[PDB]
């Protein structure tokens, strides 16, 4: 009826004060959690660098204690996951997506200490994983905890506070409030029905958790005749997005064969992967890590074309292994790394081929940063605003879109699925079937 | 659950037909906008050029400025009152209605009425913004192609309408992202799921922006300074509802002067239109789209009293031009009001807090989109628009905080989304 619309239109954007205020506490706790996590990852990563000083002269021993420290922290991580919270392996983002569909439980009393001390091990182990995973999952749970702790009722209360937690989490993981908001109202939220997620509360929670992050952690241009080059980048990003999704899902299966569910086969498998990272963290330190390290070095062009081909392959290999194996840790930040490295590499070719454009590989590096998100995750808008939050190069805002849409078109037409949805569907299907 | 799994698997699979058609809506909407943009620029140019010839006689050039902006205005109000009454004022709520399937899109009538009617009002110097026109025209262009090619389904009717209205916004502010965010935040049906394809909206926006491109750094903000941005929002949040009353209230009052009668309406439209050409010479800051004075206000050039004047004046003139139902937006006008109120707020904080080492111009940026925060209640879209237009990233948090302050206090002082009130006004009168 037209009569209900009028009633609805006039009563629009009135969120209850008790939910708004609780969004403020959620945000304050998520940002705190997020920071503590971050600090602990840094501390451990460091201790490990300090071990390679006390064994600096003996090179075989050096390479041994590079493997063992990480393998021990990974193993300690997988153990917390398998023994206490199997829901808290992998990213965590899909497991919250479900909780918003009301299809997956939010076991905060379990996931919080697991995901936190688990990722602390795997990330501190120097694995190729993000902070987004642990912070988004924890975020949602921190929102779920204060729902239950104040036994607040209603669908608005439950989705709003479960969304502001998840958004506040990402904001902290990238010092990026806007990306948090857009991530909620683009990828996270229930995609096929209406929901009562209050965006104002999401605004509050994001603000608080960014402030908490701030308290303890304080390119050229692109003319028209150059635009088609960003389309192409995107196309190439779109053909490879599904391929990457298929490998990560493929590799999910091909590693379940190695341990068949067995807690001790799994932990030991993790141990050898986590150890492989600690090792590559020394002998080849760009092939390991969550991948942030090399975004500014690649945006310049201090890397050569040879080294770029090398990193991209190695990082793909090592992103799959760490994530496909179901370690606690994201794939979001490593996709920014992969996105940059490839975009850089394209920009370098583009520079030498078309001198009449007077290119800078660094624009293609910035266009390509949030492109693999657009193709694998199918959340282009967030990756564009995240990367525009971090680097803002405005003159690039059109190139950055064209590339994103290009990859989002070719992710569809080449038979790719959104990567978080594909994992949730896997998890609902494995559960039912 | 089993239905959800079936949905997860089939997600983001927009019919290739709609994605192609979006790329024609955008192209068409972009050209439409650019043509409009060019036309308005041509008429502002004539009104200026006819003051060059009549340079002598102080009280003569006042009268020819008056009559030109009154004659162009009358032409505007008439085209709306004769052939497309639905296409007077903003046009955004009328498209918001259309997405809810509660209003019709008479593109065959509205495209020429808005395009030329706008040409009249905007080109007269009235306090109106190209969004209103380019957005409404945007959806209509997008509905025309649906009709002309005979695309079926609810997905196509909603998508091609949205992607049109979006490409419309992006061609008015060279702001693709702002255009996309406005759909998902403000335009799309607020209380139910719809089948609007974001991907289609991207395509339209891009193609639209390209058409516009084909034919066409403030200091940081320390932590201990963030509360000043909360207060600014608080000031905006109590003021937006009040300015909202006056938009609605002055629509009711300005009705009583003509009673509905096309002739008294069109004459009164010449009086208001005529004022803006008269004020547009003798004090250009109180007239026009507002994009004139925004970069001049961010440098902190205007004295205090000059801003207080410019504010009170532009409240008065914005209201009259928009509330009288003249074709044109209130989106741009609100950017310029906020940008002013911001700079005023900042200048007082500069002298009150020398130990913050403030630059008034950051408070300009923070308060630029912060009347769209309280009046029209689309912070996310505004915040991004400003960021697109200034890309002053370092102020992104102050910009969010002000925005929130404006949206909270607007809510807790009884205010409502100014566009959704205007639609409810229509529909509620449509059942009586």
């Amino acid at each position: 009826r037209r009569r209900q619309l009028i009633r609805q239109l006039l009563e629009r954007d009135k969120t209850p004060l008790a939910i708004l205020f609780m969004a403020a506490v959620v945000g304050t706790l998520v940002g705190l959690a997020a920071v503590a996590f971050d600090k602990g990852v840094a501390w451990l990563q460091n201790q490990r660098m300090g071990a390679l000083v006390h064994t600096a002269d003996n090179y075989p021993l050096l390479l041994t204690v590079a493997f063992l420290c990480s393998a021990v922290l990974a193993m300690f991580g997988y153990f917390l996951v398998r023994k206490y919270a199997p829901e808290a392996g992998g990213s965590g983002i899909p497991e919250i997506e479900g909780a918003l569909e009301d299809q997956r439980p939010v076991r905060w009393w379990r996931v919080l200490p697991v995901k936190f001390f688990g990722g602390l091990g795997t990330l501190g182990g120097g694995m190729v994983l993000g902070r987004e995973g642990p912070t988004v999952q924890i975020g949602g749970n921190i929102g779920r905890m204060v729902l239950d702790i104040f036994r607040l009722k209603g669908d608005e209360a439950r989705h709003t506070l479960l969304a502001t937690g998840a958004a506040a989490g990402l904001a902290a993981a990238f010092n990026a409030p806007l990306a948090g908001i857009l991530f909620i109202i683009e990828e996270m939220r229930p995609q096929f029905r209406y929901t009562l997620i209050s965006i104002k509360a999401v605004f509050i929670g994001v603000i608080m958790s960014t402030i908490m992050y701030r308290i303890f952690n304080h390119l050229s241009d692109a003319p028209l005749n150059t635009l088609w080059l960003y389309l192409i980048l995107g196309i190439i990003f779109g053909i490879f997005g599904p391929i990457f999704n298929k490998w990560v899902l493929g590799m999910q299966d091909l590693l379940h064969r190695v341990h068949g569910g067995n807690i001790t086969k799994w932990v030991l498998m993790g141990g050898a992967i986590g150890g492989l990272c600690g090792l590559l963290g020394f002998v080849a330190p760009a092939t390991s890590g969550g991948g942030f390290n090399l975004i500014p070095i690649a945006t310049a062009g201090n890397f050569s074309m040879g080294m770029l081909v090398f990193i991209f392959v190695a990082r793909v290999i090592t992103t799959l292994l760490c994530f496909s194996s179901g370690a606690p840790g994201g794939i979001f930040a490593p996709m920014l790394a992969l996105g940059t490295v490839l975009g850089t590499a394209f920009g370098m070719v583009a520079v030498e081929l078309f001198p009449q454009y007077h290119l800078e590989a660094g624009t293609f590096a910035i266009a390509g940063m949030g492109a693999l998100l657009a193709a694998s995750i199918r959340a282009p808008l967030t990756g564009i605003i995240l990367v525009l939050e971090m680097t803002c190069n405005y003159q690039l805002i059109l190139p950055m879109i064209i590339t994103g849409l290009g990859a989002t078109l070719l992710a569809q037409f080449t038979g790719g699925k959104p990567l978080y949805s594909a994992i949730l569907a896997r998890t609902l299907a494995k559960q039912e079937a | 659950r089993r239905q959800l799994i079936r949905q997860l698997l089939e997600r983001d699979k927009t019919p290739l037909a709609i994605l192609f058609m979006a790329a024609v809506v955008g192209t068409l909407v972009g050209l439409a906008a650019v043509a409009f943009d060019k036309g308005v620029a041509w008429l502002q140019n004539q009104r200026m050029g006819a003051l060059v010839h009549t340079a002598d006689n102080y009280p003569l050039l006042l009268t020819v400025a008056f009559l030109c902006s009154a004659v162009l205005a009358m032409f505007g109000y008439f085209l709306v009152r004769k052939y497309a009454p639905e296409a007077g004022g903003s046009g955004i709520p009328e498209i918001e209605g259309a997405l809810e399937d509660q209003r019709p899109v008479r593109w065959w009538r509205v495209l020429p009425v808005k395009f030329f009617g706008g040409l009249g009002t905007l080109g007269g110097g009235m306090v109106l913004g190209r969004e209103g026109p380019t957005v409404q025209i945007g959806g209509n262009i997008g509905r025309m192609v649906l009709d002309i090619f005979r695309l079926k389904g609810d997905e196509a009717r909603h998508t091609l309408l949205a992607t049109g209205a979006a490409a419309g916004l992006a061609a008015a502010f060279n702001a693709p992202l702002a255009g996309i965010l406005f759909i998902i935040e403000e335009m799309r049906p607020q209380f139910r799921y719809t089948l609007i394809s974001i991907k289609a909206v991207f395509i339209g926006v891009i193609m639209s922006t390209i058409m516009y491109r084909i034919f066409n750094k403030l200091s940081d903000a320390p932590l201990n300074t963030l509360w000043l941005y909360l207060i600014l929002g608080i000031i905006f949040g109590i003021f937006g509802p009040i300015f909202n009353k006056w938009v609605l209230g002055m629509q009711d009052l300005l009705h009583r002067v003509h009673g509905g009668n096309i002739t008294k309406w069109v004459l009164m439209g010449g009086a208001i239109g005529g004022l803006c050409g008269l004020l547009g010479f003798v004090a250009p800051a109180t007239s026009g789209g507002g994009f004139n004075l925004i970069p001049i206000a961010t440098a902190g050039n205007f004295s205090m009293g000059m801003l207080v004047f410019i504010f009170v004046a532009r409240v008065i003139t914005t209201l009259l031009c928009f509330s009288s139902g003249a074709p044109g937006g209130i989106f741009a006008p609100m950017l310029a009001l906020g940008t002013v109120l911001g700079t005023a707020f900042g200048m007082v904080a500069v002298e009150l807090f020398p130990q913050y080492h403030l630059e008034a111009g950051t408070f300009a940026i923070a308060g630029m989109g912060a009347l769209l925060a309280a009046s029209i209640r689309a912070p996310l879209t505004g915040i991004i628009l400003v960021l697109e237009m200034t890309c002053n990233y370092q102020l992104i948090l102050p910009m969010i905080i002000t925005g929130l302050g404006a949206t909270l206090l607007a809510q807790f002082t009884g205010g409502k989304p100014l566009y959704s009130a205007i639609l409810a006004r229509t529909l509620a009168k449509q059942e009586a």
Partner: antibody
Framework: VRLLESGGGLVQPGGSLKLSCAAS????????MSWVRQAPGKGLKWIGEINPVSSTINYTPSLKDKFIISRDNAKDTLYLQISKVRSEDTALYYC??????????????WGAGTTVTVSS | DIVLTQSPAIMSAAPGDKVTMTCSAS?????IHWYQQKSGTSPKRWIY???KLTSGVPVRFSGSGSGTSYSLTINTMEAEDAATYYCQQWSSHPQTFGGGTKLEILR
């Protein structure tokens, strides 16, 4: 990051001098610049500051034209003019670049100093 | 304007000693900074927003205090800390420095 100041030495009581400070190794504009002086074996006294575009120039408590700070961003140079000079003004004149943590400002990198000797 | 007064004017300590010096303010202040001035050298920013070390400053250094009283402490002092240390607030305008505390070494 180098801040090298100059133009000090001997001034007669009542005259004046232009101290300058040449910045290098950083985007000079973007920064508020300031002068601080230190009389023989004594404390540090702020003299004034100046924002990048020279639209805000604050001094310590002093007479209207005693001090005149300025800056020229195309040279990356700060200036300090001192008039009606008296032995109170004999001191080492440091030029320092400003910045903040949480937002409570501070004197970030300091120059080597120039000595001004008020003497006939 | 705010007067900061630095409690020990000249202190002395054998390396190994824990050393503490004070900065008492006439009115209330917040987030004060400390500078370091060795003979012949210009002041170097040392500690800022009350307890943050400038990058480069060894961990033996710390700061604290609030309202009207602030310390900077050297937990096990070394001989290479021999210097005159100025505190300084700019929570109020104009900013203002202490009169210093000159640390001397016993050997």
């Amino acid at each position: 990051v180098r801040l090298l100041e100059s133009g000090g030495g001997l001034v007669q009581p009542g005259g004046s001098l232009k101290l300058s400070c040449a910045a290098s190794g950083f985007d000079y504009s973007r920064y508020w610049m300031s002068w601080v002086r230190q009389a023989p074996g004594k404390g540090l006294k702020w003299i004034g500051e100046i924002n990048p575009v020279s639209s805000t120039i604050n001094y310590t408590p002093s007479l209207k034209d005693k001090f005149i700070i300025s800056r020229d961003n195309a040279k990356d140079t700060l200036y300090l003019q001192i008039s009606k000079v008296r032995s109170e003004d004999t001191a080492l004149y440091y030029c320092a670049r400003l910045y903040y943590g949480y937002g409570y400002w501070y004197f970030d990198v300091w120059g080597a100093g120039t000595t001004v000797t008020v003497s006939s | 304007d705010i007067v900061l007064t630095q409690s020990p004017a000249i202190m002395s300590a054998a390396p190994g000693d824990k050393v503490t010096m004070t900065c008492s303010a006439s009115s209330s202040v917040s987030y004060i900074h400390w500078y370091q001035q060795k003979s012949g050298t210009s002041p170097k920013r040392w500690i800022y927003d009350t307890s943050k070390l400038t990058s480069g400053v060894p961990v033996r250094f710390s700061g604290s205090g609030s309202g009207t009283s602030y310390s900077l402490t050297i937990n096990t002092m070394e001989a290479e800390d021999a210097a005159t240390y100025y505190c300084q607030q700019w929570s109020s305008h104009p900013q203002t420095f202490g009169g210093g505390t000159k640390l001397e070494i016993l050997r």
